[PDB]
């Protein structure tokens, strides 16, 4: 069943062949094919930034879950959704979560309300985690996305004739 | 540990040197370097607008927390997140929060449900706070962001050859 569901995606994508017939849509699809160079540049740039921000935030928070599937989720998945307006402030900002004792390790700890945000996170320098979130949103949600729009606009005008 | 986490960010950023080898990615990175003039203009314009809107909203609400770390959060941090779809309407709109008596100061007061939104805020002219939010979203989320896209598009086309 699982592979068939993915197989349905391939069949549905084949439907794009219809628009090649139309005079005003055929050129559009060809231009779309030529945008892959711009998309790959954005993905590689985004991938580097996600790794840098994701690991640093995970390293600063020090969640006590420390599980490989969960660590990958907090490093890659959670920052990725922050690009699309999903910002779980209650899972990184210590001021939004109650303080509690969870581990015998020295320092202070806070208990996030999220299910996959870890049992408890460190609060040594949480202003930096907030600051990193501020910088990440500026670079990803604004600088990178607007850069891709400019790259798309230039490419569309250049390859329109060909 | 804290500085090492930031140090990891610097090491990861160095990875962008790889794309300089590729023929179709090397020029892209150079153009990115030349976009800093546009970014600085947007940041300075945004910084002025955040200060203007942030302080006025804080001044109108008159939250009773009145703590310097919290005041800075409500002046800079909260309006910044409003750009990226994080609009805590229950923390400024009085109609969304219950009315209660918190201080002996004359007037009427309401109790926000937020943890860092202040113990209670004034409700003298709350329609203006809502109106300021409407104007802020128009200028920031629409006018400034779309302006930066246009500035990026013009710069990308101009410096492509060089």
From Swiss-Prot, chains A, B:
Phenotype upon changing residue 158 to A: Becomes insensitive to decavanadate's voltage modulation effect
Impact reported for residue 79 to S: In PFHB1B; incomplete right bundle-branch block
Protein name: Transient receptor potential cation channel subfamily M member 4
Disulphide connectivity of cysteines: 102-120
Tissue-by-tissue expression: Widely expressed with a high expression in intestine and prostate. In brain, it is both expressed in whole cerebral arteries and isolated vascular smooth muscle cells. Prominently expressed in Purkinje fibers. Expressed at higher levels in T-helper 2 (Th2) cells as compared to T-helper 1 (Th1) cells. Expressed in keratocytes.
Disease as annotated in the protein's UniProt record: Progressive familial heart block 1B: A cardiac bundle branch disorder characterized by progressive alteration of cardiac conduction through the His-Purkinje system, with a pattern of a right bundle-branch block and/or left anterior hemiblock occurring individually or together. It leads to complete atrio-ventricular block causing syncope and sudden death.
Assembly description: Homotetramer.
Gene it is expressed from: TRPM4
Phenotype upon changing residue 91 to A: Results in a functional channel that exhibits extremely fast desensitization, possibly indicating destabilization of the pore
Topological region Extracellular: 61-72, 94-128
Entry superkingdom: Eukaryota
Organism: Homo sapiens
Regions that enter the bilayer but do not cross it: 73-93
Full-protein positions shown: 892 to 1053 of 1214
Residues annotated as glycosylated: 101
